[PDB]
Design a protein around this ligand. Structure first.
Ligand SMILES: Nc1ncnc2c1ncn2[C@@H]1O[C@H](COP(=O)(O)OP(=O)(O)OC[C@H]2O[C@@H](n3cnc(C[C@H](N)C(=O)O)c3)[C@H](O)[C@@H]2O)[C@@H](O)[C@H]1O
Ligand SMILES: Nc1ncnc2c1ncn2[C@@H]1O[C@H](COP(=O)(O)OP(=O)(O)OC[C@H]2O[C@@H](n3cnc(C[C@H](N)C(=O)O)c3)[C@H](O)[C@@H]2O)[C@@H](O)[C@H]1O
Lengths: 207, 211
């Protein structure tokens, strides 16, 4: 099923699709972690995540070195902490949740937190506040292009202080989008893509 | 014009009322600043705010000393920074926005930020993130009692990066309430109070659309 929600003049469309099949004339969101980690060894970053699929599909190992340098050099990324201890490897600079690094037509999001076991996790309020910063970045950077975003949080992300369901993750995305709209009266045209069986789990009647 | 909203099995009532006329057996929310400042001299804290009215109504200058001590003794208040320079006076410990200090039947909220001019202000995302933490504390502390709350942000607070109106502040309060409900599936029974003729500036039709 495909739907288009008119949110007081701003249309958000929810439909089935593949984030990697969107034409190049559009922006695509991919959730990274609070370190923008790029090591896809199934230890730090897992190849099953979009974070992992994106790096393996578009980046050779020597290209990853340049990507790490461009992120490090992006002065707009707000730093929360430096010289953090990663016991199994990984980058040592932690960024604010919801920070967006622009990688050509892709918006790479500092989405989830990592502990010393490299377990991606968010408290519910951290998830809500992260999405707020994501819409803030998206509404700033869209430049009249359309933005495609997956159902952020509905993957391996551990929601450690709630029993939130995928339908509720979608509702939090729409609520924080409506909050962000108040600041950006002309927001981006956003499309939320559902993947495979996740399209059936969403109740479009309530949506 | 008084209405009750049913938000997925949770009732949030919006009515006209006076926060200082609520029965003692209920919890009442009052917005302080990020420092929990208590000096009402119209320089730091202005007597026109609920922050100032609450202090003048219930606290002598001698009692304020004990209140200042009880706040800094509260280990639950998360500290963002210590020893900030206040050029015109005030407290130097800064707390996370939305921190709630419980003062008997009152919830005192670290609501707004202060600059070196002592200007209460919030960016819109700071306001939304503040309300998120407020509902978190309220849903944690309510203990089956009813919680009464004013329309936070609709007073002297400066919204510095948007043209947010009164109705939109109320909509953000409800949206952040709905988010916090996902974590607290038995949320507090909440009543939002509108003062004097502020109910006349509220579009109650748009409020019912939250159902
Ligand atoms: N082609 C496609 N098009 C459109 N939608 C698609 C799609 N394919 C799949 N979807 C669906 O889209 C939803 C989102 O997908 P996804 O982004 O993967 O999930 P997420 O929860 O939003 O984010 C994951 C978080 O974990 C971190 N992380 C990275 N590696 C680790 C391992 C670590 N050691 C640990 O154990 O934690 C942790 C990573 O940095 C990130 O922050 C999902 O429903 C999926 O089915
Ligand atoms: N009896 C009643 N019952 C029910 N509702 C009532 C009521 N009375 C009034 N209402 C209505 O309730 C709404 C909220 O009232 P109120 O709390 O006053 O406004 P607020 O924006 O939510 O919070 C103010 C912020 O500024 C800070 N601040 C403190 N002093 C300064 C001066 C500083 N030098 C500067 O210049 O900034 C700044 C203070 O710490 C706080 O964070 C409003 O619509 C009002 O009409």
């Amino acid at each position: 099923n495909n739907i288009t929600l008119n949110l007081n003049g701003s249309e958000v469309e929810i439909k089935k699709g593949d984030i990697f099949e969107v034409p190049r004339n559009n922006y695509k969101v991919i959730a990274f972690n609070e370190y923008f980690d790029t090591q896809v060894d199934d230890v730090i970053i897992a190849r099953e995540t979009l974070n992992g699929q994106y790096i393996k599909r578009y980046y050779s190992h020597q290209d990853i070195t340049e990507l790490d340098q461009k992120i490090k050099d992006d002065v707009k990324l707000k730093i929360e902490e430096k010289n953090v201890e990663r016991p199994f490897g990984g980058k040592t600079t932690r960024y604010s949740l919801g920070s967006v690094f622009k990688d050509m037509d892709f918006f790479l999001v500092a989405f989830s937190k990592f502990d010393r076991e490299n377990r991606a996790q968010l408290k519910l309020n951290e998830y809500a506040s992260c999405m707020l910063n994501v819409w803030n970045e998206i509404n700033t950077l869209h430049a009249s292009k359309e933005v495609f975003i997956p159902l952020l949080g509905s993957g391996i992300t551990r929601h450690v202080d709630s029993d939130v369901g995928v339908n509720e993750l979608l509702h939090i995305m729409l609520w924080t989008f409506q909050i962000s709209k108040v600041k950006f009266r002309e927001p981006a045209k956003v499309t939320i893509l559902l993947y495979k069986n996740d399209h059936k789990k969403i109740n479009f009647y309530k949506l």
